[PDB]
Write a protein that binds this ligand. Structure first.
Ligand code: HEM
Ligand SMILES: *[C@@H]1O[C@H](CO)[C@@H](O[C@@H]2O[C@H](CO)[C@@H](O)[C@H](O)[C@H]2NC(C)=O)[C@H](O)[C@H]1NC(C)=O
Ligand code: NAG
Ligand code: NAG
Ligand code: CA
Length: 595
């Protein structure tokens, strides 16, 4: 053992152990090892990390240092040759609503975040990276390949900063560099409430005993709540419209406002906590502040576990759903709840499900206004279009009535993310989400494609021919072997995403395995899973078994017509029924009467 346990973790964390509510930090879930499943620890390593020096350095950092006797291609080149595409016609998913994309990004944010390293508070190292494109330290710039239109217009590289890691922060190893997971691994609404105590209350409304979440005071949505503004300037949401002067939001998770449609969902969620607290009180007026917030918070994590596990994963995993996640068999103490370093890349399949435009729909679900359809790239860190362009209900309608993008081997990721990404502190709509992902696999030390196929007990192509049969694509196979030179070197993100989709799901076999096992572990390692006997009353569970993403829209917007199955593709008004026809979360079983 390199080190059996390493430094840099909050020491002052201790366990009640008979309390009914999860900690904010994830700590105390597991009794045998308390730190397991908690924020600010290291991502689990299902397989030994693979670095250039075997410790912390990434493949593609030292030019002459090959991986298996071959230079790894530049991320941007893999981006340009395989990932990109021009024609947006015929890419939409006939049977996946835009909500299908959004929910994956929401679930993913609840489960994992590996942030960039610090010490850039007043760093021109941050800038040195920006301006002179010099590779050093944590500055791991993405260099453009010769023949790249960004050479001509943007400079020599796209900045990129290595992710945070445990113990020594700048910069030390061993044990071989292990990256941080800043959020709780349990599916527990951390994205509404925060994963630090400091954030969590910062966000509660403690100016009153009602247990409500702190809302916006400087703006409203037909009298409905909006998430509070984050007052940390420099703010990028201000930076996108110097005029509009509208900052990003404050949510339990830092990425809330990365695009308007994620910000939107956050909104629906905050509204759900407040909405619920008023009710707990009405039925239980005696209940204090904490009692109200804790119990609403508990209802909420349970709602996310149900939508995720009953509605969402079956349609992501397909046939592969039972092979990996069999019907719940109760809490298992031996199960390692931690998110693995590789899941955070596996879950990135969502990137190829993001479309190039967002829509606003009116009451008749028709283009609301002159400019209802907008390019995705003018919606990164855009909050002003919610508050000042007539409200969320129309973005929510877009979500129901528009279609997710289908992953496509010849059409993987839209240019909106591929050439136009806005990243905070960097100024242009000019970054590349695909290249980022690849540079990151390398930063996080991921094992190649074949290691992961090995891990999942799948065949391991060694030849152009081999790869053709697995991907079922001759040209993709060939491009990939022309750059990688062997499948042993293919970055997992691309490797996994290249595989044709399994039956009735949205990922290949490699990912259905990577995804399948992770989620199974987070459901089986949660002392607080909702269906865990003892956590809710039988009664209470028969009341949650009814919740629906349709219901969540009804109870928290002025939309009065919704689909019954929100994630399949639903055209108005055939597939649309009035809210009246939809099952309500009967909170009656939460009555706690003293006499
Ligand atoms: C338009 C919507 C989206 C945008 C603009 C976006 C953008 C980003 C960005 C900038 C990062 C940070 C990458 C890095 O610096 O390494 C990221 C990471 C990630 N994305 Fe997305 N993404 C979107 C949608 C999604 C979806 C739909 C999914 C899954 C269904 C997803 C899953 C992830 C995951 C798991 C991470 C890594 C987070 C971590 O560090 O644990 N994203 N995305
Ligand atoms: C910045 O925000 C303002 C709105 O806050 C945008 O201006 C609006 O756009 C049209 C006219 O151009 C009108 O329908 C709105 O009523 C305008 N409002 C105001 C105050 O001008 C403007 O387009 C945004 N700029 C950018 C670059 O996004
Ligand atoms: C806190 O709750 C009180 C009581 O409803 C309300 O008047 C106030 O607006 C809330 N404050 C904030 C900052 O959200
Ligand atoms: C508990 O999890 C461990 C780890 O796989 C394993 O022994 C077993 O399958 C599970 N079963 C029970 C009954 O806890
Ligand atoms: Ca979580």
């Amino acid at each position: 053992s390199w080190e059996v346990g390493c430094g840099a973790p909050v020491p002052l964390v201790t366990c009640d152990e008979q309390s009914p509510y999860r900690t904010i930090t994830g700590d105390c879930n597991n009794r045998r090892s308390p730190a397991l499943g908690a924020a600010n620890r290291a991502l689990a390593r299902w397989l030994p990390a693979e670095y250039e020096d075997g410790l912390a350095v990434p493949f593609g950092w030292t030019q002459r240092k090959t991986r298996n006797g071959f230079r790894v291609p530049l991320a941007r080149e893999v981006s340009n040759k395989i990932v990109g595409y021009l024609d947006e016609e015929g890419v939409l998913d006939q049977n996946r609503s835009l909500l299908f994309m959004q929910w994956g990004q929401i679930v993913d944010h609840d489960l994992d975040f590996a942030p960039e390293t610090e010490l850039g508070s007043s760093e021109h190292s941050k800038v040195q990276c920006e301006e002179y494109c010099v590779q050093g330290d944590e500055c791991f710039p993405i260099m453009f390949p010769k023949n790249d239109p960004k050479l001509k217009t943007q400079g020599k590289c796209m900045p990129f900063f290595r992710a945070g890691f445990v113990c020594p922060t700048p910069p030390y190893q061993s044990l071989a560099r292990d990256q941080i997971n800043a959020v709780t691994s349990f599916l527990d609404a951390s994205l509404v409430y925060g994963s630090e105590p400091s954030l969590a209350s910062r966000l509660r409304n403690l100016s009153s005993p009602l247990g409500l979440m702190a809302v916006n005071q400087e703006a409203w949505d037909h009298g409905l709540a909006y998430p509070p503004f984050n007052n940390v300037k420099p703010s990028p949401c201000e930076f996108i419209n110097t005029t509009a002067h509208v900052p990003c939001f404050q949510a339990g998770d830092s990425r809330a406002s990365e695009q308007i449609l994620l910000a939107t969902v956050h909104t629906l969620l905050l509204r759900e906590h407040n909405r619920l607290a008023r009710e707990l009180k009405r039925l239980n007026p005696h209940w204090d502040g904490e009692m109200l917030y804790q119990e609403a918070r508990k209802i909420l994590g349970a709602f996310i576990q149900i939508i995720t596990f009953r509605d969402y994963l079956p349609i992501v995993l397909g046939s592969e759903m039972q092979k990996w996640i069999p019907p719940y068999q109760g809490y298992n103490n031996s199960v390692d709840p931690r998110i693995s370093n590789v899941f955070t890349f596996a879950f990135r399949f969502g990137h190829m499900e993001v479309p190039s435009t967002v829509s606003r729909l009116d009451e008749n679900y028709q283009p609301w206004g002159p400019e209802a359809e907008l390019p995705l790239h003018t919606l990164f860190f855009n909050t002003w279009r919610i508050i000042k362009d007539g409200g969320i209900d129309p973005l929510v309608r877009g979500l129901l009535a528009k279609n997710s993008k289908l992953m496509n081997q010849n059409k993987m990721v839209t240019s909106e993310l591929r050439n136009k990404l806005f990243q905070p502190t960097h100024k242009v709509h000019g970054f590349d989400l695909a290249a980022i992902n690849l540079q990151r696999c390398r930063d996080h030390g991921m094992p190649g494609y074949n290691s992961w196929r090995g891990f999942c007990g799948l065949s391991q192509p060694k030849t152009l021919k081999g790869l053709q049969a697995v991907l079922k694509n001759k040209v993709l196979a060939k491009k990939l072997l022309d750059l990688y030179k062997t499948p042993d070197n293919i970055d997992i993100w691309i490797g996994g995403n290249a595989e044709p989709m399994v039956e009735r799901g949205r990922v290949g076999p490699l990912l259905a395995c990577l995804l399948g096992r992770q989620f199974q572990q987070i459901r089986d390692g949660d002392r607080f899973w909702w269906e865990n006997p003892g956590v809710f009353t039988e009664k209470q569970r028969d009341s949650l078994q009814k919740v629906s993403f349709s219901r969540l829209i009804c109870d928290n917007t002025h939309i009065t017509k919704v689909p019954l199955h929100a994630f399949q593709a639903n055209n108005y008004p055939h597939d649309f029924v009035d809210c009246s026809a939809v099952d309500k979360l009967d909170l009656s079983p939460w009555a706690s009467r003293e006499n």
